[PDB]
Amino acid sequence: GPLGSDYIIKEKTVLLQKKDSEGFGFVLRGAKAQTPIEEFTPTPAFPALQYLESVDEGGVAWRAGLRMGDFLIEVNGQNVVKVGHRQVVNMIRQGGNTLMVKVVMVTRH
């Protein structure tokens, strides 16, 4: 609008279950940090540190509804909004062939 950006924000909860011989079918990207970044302030347009750089077309993540740009809010019921990249990677790996993730998709109107 005239006073600033309008956004559609869509929450998605998905449970991925894969073979040992395949990936979840995404690339994760975001801020590194030894412990959770307290100096980061989430905003509706950048609501979390980690997001999906890409999602493999037809892969596990794709089939469940995950898309490029989705921001990671929760991994296996733990909030990761202000959690550094390596810790989130370790949390994804902890479930093995099972990953429960809550994401927010941010689109311009």
Partner: peptide
């Protein structure tokens, strides 16, 4: 920032 692929196992 850092990237980690989960495209393969």
């Amino acid at each position: 920032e850092e990237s980690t692929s989960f495209q393969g196992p």
